[PDB]
């Protein structure tokens, strides 16, 4: 599936030792056609009580509740998507929703209200690529000493590093990685071209770490 493909793609680049080239030509691996459509722009870890709330770059909001269910509010402010633990999806609206979801809608709004007003948008300067097509939800997440790892249902894996605020957005369908550096500049690369042309030690180190993180996701 997506994670197995991502692992293969990362291993292939990492095995090639991209930073150890005679002449690294990192810029030759850039491909703006592979810029992602979706990534996580902000998040709140309230997992001691309710779960993890997050906002995607399209200003939609989601919550992965502690009971392994998900509720998504589209950026129109009314459309909802509810995903049961099985993955069973239901579409509804805030204006017309079963009373059984009132509590979870209320929790999502508390998350939304906080995030719209008070957190920075990751990738605020990134224009998504032109698309056609499905809104993803948060499948899994965890935190380590160095990063928070966010796995979306479209296969994308996002890794936000705590120390220096650098970020990776990995897509196994594009076989691409977007790297946001500490200055918030960003580049999108085709992983196969990073294997061909190489890259700096900073990006190579984060791609080695990313492979370790995908191993963790695979082990659930």
């Amino acid at each position: 599936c997506h994670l197995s493909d991502m692992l293969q793609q990362l291993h292939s680049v990492n095995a090639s030792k991209p930073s150890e080239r005679g002449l690294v030509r990192q810029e030759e691996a850039e491909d703006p056609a592979c810029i992602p459509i979706f990534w996580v722009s902000k998040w709140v870890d309230y997992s001691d009580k309710y779960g993890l709330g997050y906002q995607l770059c399209d200003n939609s909001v989601g919550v992965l509740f502690n009971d392994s269910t998900r509720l998504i509010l589209y950026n129109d402010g009314d459309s909802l998507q509810y995903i049961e633990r099985d993955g069973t999806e239901s579409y509804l609206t805030v204006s017309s929703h079963p009373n059984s979801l009132m509590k979870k809608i209320t929790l999502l709004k508390y998350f939304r209200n906080y995030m719209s007003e008070h957190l920075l948008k990751a990738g605020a300067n990134i224009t998504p690529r032109e698309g056609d097509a499905r809104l993803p939800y948060l499948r899994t997440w965890f935190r380590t000493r160095s990063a928070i790892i966010l796995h979306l249902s479209n296969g994308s894996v996002q890794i936000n590093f705590f120390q220096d605020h650098t970020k990776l957005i990995l897509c196994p369908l594009m076989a691409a990685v977007t790297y946001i550096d500490e200055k918030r500049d960003f580049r999108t690369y085709r992983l196969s071209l990073l294997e061909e042309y190489g890259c700096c030690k900073e990006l190579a180190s984060r791609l080695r770490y990313a492979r370790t993180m995908v191993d963790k996701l695979l082990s659930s």
């Binding site: 709140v44 920075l120 990751a122 936000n160």
Partner: peptide, 5 residues
């Protein structure tokens, strides 16, 4: 609770 940047 923890927050993004």
């Amino acid at each position: 609770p923890l927050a993004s940047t």
